[PDB]
């Protein structure tokens, strides 16, 4: 998306955690949504966009819940329970069947960026970018 700054600068980017910040917002709660997107960046560094589309679905269905005589607070921790179960299920799915490699193997580290490099403006030029990043990190 293109972003015309209140200053004048132009921004075109796929980083939804930067895109959200750039697009002026009013509603104080909508603002909240921004920080939780900028969090995933300071924490992990990816999924800045996906986490937002999550904060939606949840809040969007907690909508459906309240609408059916389901208490908010009961939904709060009620959700948080499914949170700790999700962050735990993520291992029971990579223990396991798939992979958890950390070193001695670039076949994956690169492919992590290949997917990561992939789906951005640099999609076409990623080969050089993917490896480069991996190499520029794994060496530190």
């Amino acid at each position: 998306k293109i972003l015309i700054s209140p200053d004048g600068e132009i921004t075109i980017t796929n980083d939804g955690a930067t895109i959200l910040s750039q697009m002026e917002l009013d509603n104080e709660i909508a603002k909240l949504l921004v920080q939780l997107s900028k969090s995933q960046d300071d924490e992990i560094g990816d999924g800045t966009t996906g986490v937002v589309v999550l904060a939606s679905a949840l809040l969007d269905q907690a909508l459906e819940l309240i609408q059916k005589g389901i208490h908010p607070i009961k939904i709060a921790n009620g959700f948080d329970e499914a949170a700790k179960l999700a962050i735990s299920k993520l291992e029971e799915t990579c223990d396991d069947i798939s992979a958890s490699n950390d070193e001695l193997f670039r076949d994956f580290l690169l492919r992590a960026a290949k997917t990561s490099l992939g789906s951005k403006i640099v999609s076409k030029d990623h080969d050089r970018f993917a490896e480069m990043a991996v190499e520029a990190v794994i060496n530190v």
């Binding site: 459906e64 059916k68 005589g69 389901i70």
Partner: protein
């Protein structure tokens, strides 16, 4: 550029959906708190007349709201529509919609124009099953009256006047009885006066005209044989018109006597007709009641058009045309005629035993001058339900039974189609399922655990059931006498998933100022 000239706005796709789906529910949340006696009424103030209306009637509740949105004003039509065709439930005819399309909205995440196919085919299966569960009969006037009351009751409930529910349900079922099936509800006029208290609102077997007898005449009448005259008791003159010039000075010497005499033929023509009382469309000259009072003939100058006939169709005495052309054979067989003594002006009366029937369901309610209105429109909502059963013998149980049977039936089909169109079906049901749910919000019972509770019982029983608003047991509606007419609950269903169609097809719009 052109176009036709801005400023003109244009909304298309995603947002145009929300703004419409969310745009309707906006109306729906406010509208819903009007179901079951644990129901609310909203105030409605009009700019001009600077007077307010208080009552609960989905039709009026929205017909009295200035609303900018097309999608909202749209709903305001649905209401003002069912009110016309059916008469009751208008309050909810939108509720299942706003929910319905809110369902469609979520489902829209998936082509829309196909969703309409489901809601028109799947809610058709619902429309069908609801006919099956219907209970017809009986057709014995012995049994009818006992059903019509149960209908009038279930309808008259939740309305300010519920307090003496019976008192009104009786008012309704009576006026409906007179005039077989099916006759217009335009002959029985709901007149209202501001008179102390509530429940002093009786039904009248005659008419309650505004006018009060002229001069110092008797206020009562025995074996009333009234007369339906048209022409004013004044010296006549062609409509084309003509001028009379007194060419002869001696011509006036006879002209003067022609005056007093050319109207004395009114008196002679009255006594001769055996008539005892009279009343005329057009007004009568002061030179007339004078003669009337001494004779004892009663004077009732000027009567409205539709009132001229009410007094007529009450006694079937034919509307006389001009005085002295009236046959004693045509007369009003009125049982009595009196002047009720209300504060200030007092209306006259035309009581009838049959009668006749041209009912006048006059309602007082001094308590609040703006409650009569609030009430005499609920009596109506009764009337029009006590009639639909006559025209349509079919009836069905409420309390959430209506929706329960559908959502139940519809529910299975959705799990069978195992088609994308099929999910559509499932929502069509979950929209209905919403109505009872919402009906719980108001009574106070938890919704979620109340429908599931209610849906099991339909299975154990099927389809008789519902959710009790107040009386304990969560008892079946047929037991508690909570039922309304079947075709009404059809139009409601169809008529909603209709606007749900048109409104779900718009996609894009263009608005000017």
């Amino acid at each position: 550029v052109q176009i036709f000239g801005d400023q003109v706005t244009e909304e298309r796709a995603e947002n145009a959906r929300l703004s419409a789906f969310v745009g309707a529910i906006a109306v729906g949340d406010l509208v819903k708190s009007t179901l079951g006696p644990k129901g609310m009424d909203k105030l409605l103030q009009s700019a001009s007349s600077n007077t307010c209306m208080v009552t609960n009637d989905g039709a009026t509740i929205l017909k009295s709201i200035p609303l900018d949105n097309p999608a909202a004003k749209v709903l305001v039509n649905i209401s003002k529509v069912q009110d016309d065709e059916v008469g009751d439930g208008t309050t909810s005819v939108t509720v299942l919609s706003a929910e319905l399309l809110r369902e469609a909205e979520k489902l829209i995440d998936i082509h829309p124009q196909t969703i309409i196919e489901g809601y028109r085919l799947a809610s058709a299966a619902a429309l069908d099953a609801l006919t099956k569960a219907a209970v017809d009969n009986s057709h014995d006037k012995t049994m009818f009256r006992e059903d019509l009351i149960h209908i009038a009751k279930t309808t008259l409930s939740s309305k300010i006047l519920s307090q003496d529910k019976d008192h009104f349900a009786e008012l309704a079922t009576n006026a409906i009885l007179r005039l077989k099936g099916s006759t217009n509800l335009e002959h029985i006029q709901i007149i209202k006066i501001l008179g102390g208290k509530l429940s002093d609102s009786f039904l009248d077997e005659g008419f309650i005209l505004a006018k009060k007898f002229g001069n110092n005449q008797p206020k009562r009448i025995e074996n009333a044989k009234i007369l339906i005259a048209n022409t004013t008791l004044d010296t006549d003159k062609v409509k084309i018109f003509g001028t009379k010039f007194k060419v002869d000075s001696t011509a006036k010497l006879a002209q003067l006597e022609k005056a007093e005499r050319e109207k004395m033929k009114n008196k002679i023509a009255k006594i001769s007709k055996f008539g005892i009382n009279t009343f005329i469309n057009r007004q009568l000259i002061y030179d007339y009641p004078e003669q009337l009072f001494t004779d004892l003939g009663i004077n009732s100058i000027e009567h409205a058009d539709f009132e001229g006939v009410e007094r007529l169709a009450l006694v079937t005495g034919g509307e006389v045309v001009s005085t002295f052309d009236e046959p004693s054979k045509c007369k009003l067989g009125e049982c009595d005629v009196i002047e009720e003594i209300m504060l200030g002006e007092q209306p006259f009366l035309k009581f009838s035993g049959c009668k006749a029937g041209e009912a006048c369901t006059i309602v007082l309610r001094g308590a609040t001058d703006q409650t009569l209105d609030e009430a005499e429109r609920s009596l109506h909502d009764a009337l029009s339900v006590l009639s639909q059963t006559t025209k349509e013998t079919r009836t069905v149980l409420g309390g959430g039974c209506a929706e329960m049977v559908m959502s139940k039936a519809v529910d299975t089909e959705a799990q069978n189609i195992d088609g994308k169109k099929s999910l559509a079906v499932e929502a069509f049901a979950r929209a209905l399922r919403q109505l009872p749910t919402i009906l719980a919000d108001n009574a106070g019972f938890d919704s979620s655990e109340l429908v599931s509770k209610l849906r099991s019982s339909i299975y154990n029983g099927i389809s008789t059931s519902g959710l009790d608003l107040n009386n304990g047991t969560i008892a079946d509606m047929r037991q508690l006498g909570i039922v309304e007419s079947y075709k009404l609950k059809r139009a409601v269903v169809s008529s909603a998933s209709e606007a749900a169609e048109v409104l779900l097809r718009v996609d894009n719009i263009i608005r000017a100022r």
